Design a protein around this ligand. Structure first.
Ligand SMILES: C[C@H](C(=O)O)c1cccc(C(=O)c2ccccc2)c1
Ligand SMILES: C[C@H](C(=O)O)c1cccc(C(=O)c2ccccc2)c1
Ligand SMILES: C[C@H](C(=O)O)c1cccc(C(=O)c2ccccc2)c1
Ligand SMILES: CCCCCCCCC(=O)O
Length: 581
């Protein structure tokens, strides 16, 4: 391949090429308007077309990193708007691309995307290509680590909605509950992918491989070790490329893997039939979200190879990577009822037991009971899910969220109120999605979603560290994160936050808000109560938050709303300090 840009343009096609180039530049240049990005994509596409025609032509032989970085570094007002990226532009490759990746702005703090059914249908009918382009741009610049090919698929779902609802007489009623649905899927898809890039960033490639082996083995328990290894190998390279901004290489390798899985469908899973008779982007997405295959009847007993065999210490010392790899593969297949992080905890415990037993006088008598060391690792998560799902089913999403906000504020009262509310709210919505499932599917649903919310929190903590306890849980071990976070207790060294009257002061503006923005104001007050009175019992806090809810409802239903807030507000504040003693 003489011209790498021609190669990728030839393989991907103009439509997807333009999309992936837009995403690539949007994820870095988050402040630059859409119009300006379009002009940048047009110039890049023109260069690809020229190179596709004559591969010996000017600068066509240069690397994709060279061409990308050179182009990024020609953008108007770079030093002023993107001072960090501007410093990278001094450097040669591969140092320059490495600098770009380091200084990629994680949370840009742009306004929330509000659907405009009338204006967006108009823009869509006017020019749909540009309308889809704008969607890629808006999502890419808000989620800088979003997988290029996956975002193209979400753009198709976005398109499908707007083709279906714009013809309809009523638009708002048609689009909002679909665009609300699409926004959740974007948040989850973005979160899953941020965990993969975070895992690479924080724990390296060996951790991503072990996670993938565990997950694919659960999804494809029919597949043999050599098949899982092949998929994990190819998928890791895909994940590495997409996470490191190599969208063109990534889109191509992802398409190839999807083509391989579907060609070898019969020996991988019987659930891939639906996925494999679909178009390109829909196929890849379907495989990624595919239901776990039925357990094979012929899954082998593991006690013989991993507990009873007299030469395991020999197998461990000599054939280590294969032996531990085979264990993780085999143990994962037979436990779709376990979370990925639980399976990696069990693997780490298997290894640790072999280290100990194989250093001592009679190893076989020692490691014979290795499987029984897993029992505690399975019960701790199973109990917390049973316990939290009982609470959720009793009190509902709102009070469950409030329960979690109190729990975490007490664990980490140094963390900002918005973050505490966001995390407690998110893990509340986990209760809503997961607790209503069959009891066996709860733990994986819960602890896998917990991994997404904890990764979120750990990314915010990189931006603004507040707690050494949090830094340790976030950086020490991927497998041990949730346990480490669960282990945290109320820091007895913490100084109760100085009481600001203004903090618990409410006005009539609260009454016009939708129900969830109302909740957030009160949930923000709950966090502030725990911050001022952290030794207050969970029951004391439930009482006071009740008084705040009663007060808001009373004054929002008043003749003079502002006179009610102004009169009753200070009284509620004063009595609450005494109630939380
Ligand atoms: C509007 C402009 C164009 O089309 O010149 C443009 C610039 C960049 C990306 C894209 C796209 O993603 C896209 C989406 C659907 C069809 C074709 C392109 C489109
Ligand atoms: C690095 C990244 C990728 O490898 O996916 C990427 C994204 C978009 C475009 C290009 C280019 O090769 C390019 C070509 C000409 C001008 C500007 C960029 C490269
Ligand atoms: C209802 C139940 C109880 O009190 O035994 C319970 C269990 C767990 C946590 C909490 C809370 O902290 C809480 C605080 C305010 C509102 C809602 C829940 C309450
Ligand atoms: C700083 C926020 C702490 C969040 C801990 C979440 C762990 C899950 C739990 O045990 O509830």
């Amino acid at each position: 391949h003489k011209s790498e840009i021609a190669h990728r343009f030839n393989d991907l096609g103009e439509k997807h090429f333009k999309g992936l180039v837009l995403v690539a530049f949007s994820q870095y240049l988050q402040q630059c308007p859409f119009e300006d990005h379009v002009k940048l994509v047009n110039e890049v596409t023109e260069f690809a077309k020229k190179c596709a025609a004559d591969e010996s032509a000017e600068n066509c032989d240069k690397s994709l990193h060279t061409l990308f970085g050179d182009k990024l570094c020609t953008v108007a007002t770079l030093r002023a708007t993107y001072g960090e990226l501007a410093d990278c532009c001094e450097k040669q490759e591969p140092e320059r691309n490495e600098c770009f990746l380091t200084h990629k702005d994680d949370h840009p703090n742009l306004p929330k995307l509000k659907p405009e059914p009338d204006a967006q249908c108009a823009a869509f009918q006017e020019d749909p290509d540009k309308f889809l382009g704008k969607y890629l741009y808006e999502v890419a610049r808000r989620h800088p680590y979003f997988y290029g090919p996956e975002l193209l698929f979400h753009a198709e779902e976005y398109k499908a909605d707007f083709t279906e609802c714009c013809p309809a007489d009523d638009k708002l009623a048609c689009l909002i509950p679909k665009l609300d649905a699409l926004k959740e899927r974007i948040l989850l898809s973005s979160a899953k992918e941020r965990l993969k890039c975070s895992s690479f960033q924080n724990f390296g490639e060996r951790a991503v491989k072990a996670w993938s082996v565990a997950r694919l083995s659960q999804k494809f328990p029919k597949a043999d070790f050599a098949e899982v290894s092949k998929i994990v190998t190819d998928l890791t390279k895909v994940h590495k490329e997409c996470c490191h901004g190599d969208l063109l290489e990534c889109a191509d390798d992802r398409a190839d893997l999807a083509k391989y899985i579907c060609e070898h469908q019969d020996s991988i899973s019987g659930k891939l039939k639906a996925c494999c008779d679909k178009p390109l982007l829909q196929k890849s997405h379907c495989i990624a979200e595919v239901k776990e295959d039925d357990l094979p009847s012929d899954l082998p007993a593991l006690a013989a190879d991993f507990a009873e065999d007299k030469e395991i210490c020999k197998h461990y010392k000599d054939a280590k990577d294969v032996f531990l790899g085979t264990f993780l593969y085999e143990y994962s297949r037979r436990h779709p009822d376990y979370s990925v992080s639980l399976l990696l905890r069990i693997a780490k415990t298997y290894e640790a037991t072999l280290e100990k037993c194989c250093a001592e006088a009679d190893p076989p008598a020692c490691y014979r009971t290795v499987f029984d060391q897993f029992t505690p690792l399975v019960e701790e998560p199973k109990s917390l899910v049973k316990k939290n799902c009982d609470l959720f089913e009793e009190v509902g999403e709102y009070d469950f969220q409030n329960a979690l906000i109190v729990r975490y504020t007490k664990k980490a009262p140094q963390v900002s109120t918005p973050t505490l509310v966001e995390i407690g709210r998110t893990l509340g919505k986990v209760g809503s999605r997961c607790c209503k499932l069959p009891e066996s599917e709860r733990l994986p649903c819960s602890e896998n979603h917990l991994a997404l919310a904890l990764n979120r929190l750990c990314v915010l903590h990189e931006k603004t560290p507040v707690s050494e306890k949090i830094t340790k849980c976030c950086t020490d071990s991927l497998a041990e994160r949730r346990p480490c976070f669960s282990a945290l207790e109320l820091d007895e060294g913490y100084v109760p936050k100085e009481f600001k009257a203004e903090t618990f002061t409410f006005h009539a503006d609260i009454c016009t808000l939708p129900e969830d923005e109302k909740q957030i104001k009160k949930q923000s007050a709950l966090a502030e109560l725990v911050k001022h009175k952290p030794k207050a019992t969970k029951e004391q806090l439930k009482t006071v938050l009740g008084n705040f809810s009663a007060f808001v409802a009373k004054c929002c239903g008043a003749e003079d709303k502002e006179a009610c807030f102004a009169e009753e507000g200070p009284k509620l504040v004063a009595s609450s300090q005494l109630a939380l003693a």
